[PDB]
Structure formats: structure tokens, C-alpha cells
Amino acid sequence: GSSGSSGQDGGRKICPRCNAQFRVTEALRGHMCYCCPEMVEYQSGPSSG
Ligand SMILES: [Zn+2]
Numbered sequence: 369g370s371s372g373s374s375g376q377d378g379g380r381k382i383c384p385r386c387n388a389q390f391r392v393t394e395a396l397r398g399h400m401c402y403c404c405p406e407m408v409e410y411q412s413g414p415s416s417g
Contacts, residue, residue, distance in 0.1 A: 370376075381396055382388070385404035390396045401408045 377391070381390060381393070383390075383396065383400060383404060384407065385400075388399070390399070397408075
């Protein structure tokens with residue numbers, strides 16, 4: 369699909385769970401954390417001692 373979306377968005381980011389539509393990386397960050405906390409993975413801590 370080309371006609372319509374004024375300028376295709378790069379790095380099509382879509383939730384592998386609900387499969388919603390997002391524009392900013394912020395919305396996904398949170399929405400995902402809750403919706404699908406599976407993917408959401410980042411080193412926060414504490415670490416192994
Ligand atoms: Zn989702």
C-alpha cells in the first residue's frame with residue numbers, strides 16, 4: 369500500500385502481540401511494557417554479585 373499514508377514510516381514498528389499502530393517510540397515503549405512485557409528487555413539492575 370502506497371497511496372494514503374503521506375510518507376511511509378521507516379522501521380515499521382508494530383507490536384508482535386496486539387499489532388497496533390504507533391508513530392513515536394515512546395508510546396510503544398510503555399504500551400508494550402504493559403501490553404507485552406515479554407519483548408521489553410533492558411539492563412536496569414541490580415546486577416549479579
Ligand atoms: Zn501491544
